[PDB]
Amino acid sequence: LWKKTFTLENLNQLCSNSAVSHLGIEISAFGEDWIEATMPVDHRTMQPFGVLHGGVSVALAETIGSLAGSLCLEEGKTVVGLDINANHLRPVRSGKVTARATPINLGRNIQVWQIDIRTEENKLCCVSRLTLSVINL
């Protein structure tokens, strides 16, 4: 559960003028134990032949997962990406995809997050697991 209070407006403002904003990523929604971000599938995020770039899908997964992790810490605490993995399940040709981050294990020094990315038709196109280090900033 979240340890910090936040608003979608402020989170997006926090991600402005960075790789996140550059890829058209928008923190779109959250629940009590999950948070999502959407990303469009267009020339900024597609491979040269017209389908969502799998590498960019991973960029979305690390973004939402890292953000989620940072919201689960108290003051004077932040996360740093240690490693990440993903499986590309199906090609996406249009619309926007939505990546949802849910916690797997939140430890004192390490956090592990799951990220499921779905198409506008609610079909899973990518699944990823992210490992974060917790450090005193």
Swiss-Prot record:
PANTHER family: 1,4-DIHYDROXY-2-NAPHTHOYL-COA THIOESTERASE 1 (PTHR43240:SF5). Its EC number is 3.1.2.-. The lineage of its organism: Bacteria, Pseudomonadati, Pseudomonadota, Gammaproteobacteria, Pasteurellales. It holds the Pfam family 4HBT. GO terms for molecular function: 1,4-dihydroxy-2-naphthoyl-CoA thioesterase activity. Belongs to the thioesterase PaaI family. It comes from the Bacteria. It comes from Haemophilus influenzae (strain ATCC 51907 / DSM 11121 / KW20 / Rd). Keywords: Hydrolase. This is Putative esterase HI_1161. InterPro entries: HotDog_dom_sf (IPR029069), PAAI_dom (IPR003736), Thioestr_dom (IPR006683).
